[PDB]
Amino acid sequence: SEFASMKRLSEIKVLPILESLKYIKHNHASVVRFGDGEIDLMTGHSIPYQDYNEKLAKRLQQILQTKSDEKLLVCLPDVFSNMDRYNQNARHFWERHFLKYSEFYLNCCDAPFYGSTFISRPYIDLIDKSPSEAYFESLKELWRGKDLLIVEGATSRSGVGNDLFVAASSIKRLVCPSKNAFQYYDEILRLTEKNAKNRLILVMLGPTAKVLVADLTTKGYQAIDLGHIDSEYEWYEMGATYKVKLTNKHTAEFNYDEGIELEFSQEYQEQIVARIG
């Protein structure tokens, strides 16, 4: 009975977006998020912007086994209870996902609580988009007045052309490959450490981001895996009802990165400390 499995998995306890944010701020915690692509990778599959890699899969598994505490919040998709928050397409996607990974989800995740992987996904799949403004305003309090190090891909351009990070005191960016970043992992970690002094680190880098956040946290940094936050903010700012493609940068779930018409944004260019790849 697949239904039986659905009920059993509702034993997994995720702190919803706003509650996750309170945990993060109260504890100054790093944040690592596991989504469908991470489970795909951990179980042996390649995903649109990251080929399967055995070392990556192993690290992801180790990280998911780490208990959430004062230093790190480990997050899962917030779909195990109150699935009715999400639109029909999203509900179907996620149920098929966690049923397909019954073997995995049944044995992987018996921590007392997890954060929400959807702290980066606060808008587009919701039926009631009313709390979204509150979600983004709470997110923004993470970086208001902070010096940021943003580690992201060449097409991510997080906050470029919008006001998401306007209140950050400064931004430096380590710009990595838009796909298959794990290939360059050692260099990414090395340069992130070098540039992280007195900065809050934000990471938008697919599966590679999870390892980076974990390794940085072990070395004593606060690093926050924010994934596709920019896409959701862009959709939110334009009052989108569906996932419309952005023309000037990467768009979540258009992960082949086709049809992009880049611009030269001087402010963005001046923030770039180095490119990897």
Annotated binding-site residue? 177: yes
Check binding of 180 to ligand UDP (CB under 6 A). Answer: yes
Nearby residues of 82 by Cβ (< 8 Å), 6 or more positions away: none
What is the number of the residue whose Cβ is closest to ligand UDP? 153
Q: Please give the structure tokens belonging to residue 240.
A: 């989108």
Binder to ligand UDP among 164, 204, 213, 246 (CB under 6 A)? 204
- Residue showing tokens 């649109």: 48
Annotated binding-site residue? 156: yes
CA 236 – CA 240 distance, rounded (Å): 6
Check binding of 146 to ligand UDP (CB under 6 A). Answer: no
Binder to ligand UDP among 49, 80, 165, 236 (CB under 6 A)? 49
Annotated binding-site residue? 173: no
Task: Give least dist CB 76 to ligand UDP, A.
Answer: 11
Q: Where are the beta strands (DSSP E) in 10-83?
A: 30-33, 72-76
CA 165 – CA 7 distance, rounded (Å): 40
Binder to ligand UDP among 30, 50, 132, 138 (CB under 6 A)? 50
Classified as helix, coil or strand, 225 is: strand
Give whole-number Cα distances, 226 to 43, 72, 142, 213, in Å: 23, 14, 11, 11
Judged by CB under 6 A, the chain residues 222 through 251 that form the site for ligand UDP are: 227-228, 250
Check binding of 155 to ligand UDP (CB under 6 A). Answer: yes
Tell me whether residue 11 or residue 209 sits nearer to ligand UDP (CB atom): 209
Check binding of 35 to ligand UDP (CB under 6 A). Answer: yes
User: DSSP character for 204?
Assistant: E
Task: Give least dist CB 195 to ligand UDP, A.
Answer: 17
Check binding of 178 to ligand UDP (CB under 6 A). Answer: yes
Check binding of 68 to ligand UDP (CB under 6 A). Answer: no
Annotated binding-site residue? 161: no
DSSP 73-110: EEEE-S-SS-GGGB-HHHHHHHHHHHHHTHHHHHHH--
Judged by CB under 6 A, the chain residues 82 through 141 that form the site for ligand UDP are: 120-121
Annotated binding-site residue? 121: yes
Burial of 61 (0-12, 13-18, 19+ CB in 10 A): middle
Q: Which helix H or strand E contains 3, and what residues bound it?
A: helix 2-9
Tell me whether residue 118 or residue 221 sits nearer to ligand UDP (CB atom): 118
Question: Rule CB under 6 A: which residues touch ligand UDP?
Answer: 33, 35, 37, 49-50, 120-121, 152-153, 155-156, 176-181, 204-206, 208-209, 227-228, 250, 252
Can you say which residues are annotated as belonging to the binding site for UDP?
33, 49, 120-121, 156, 177, 181, 206, 210, 228
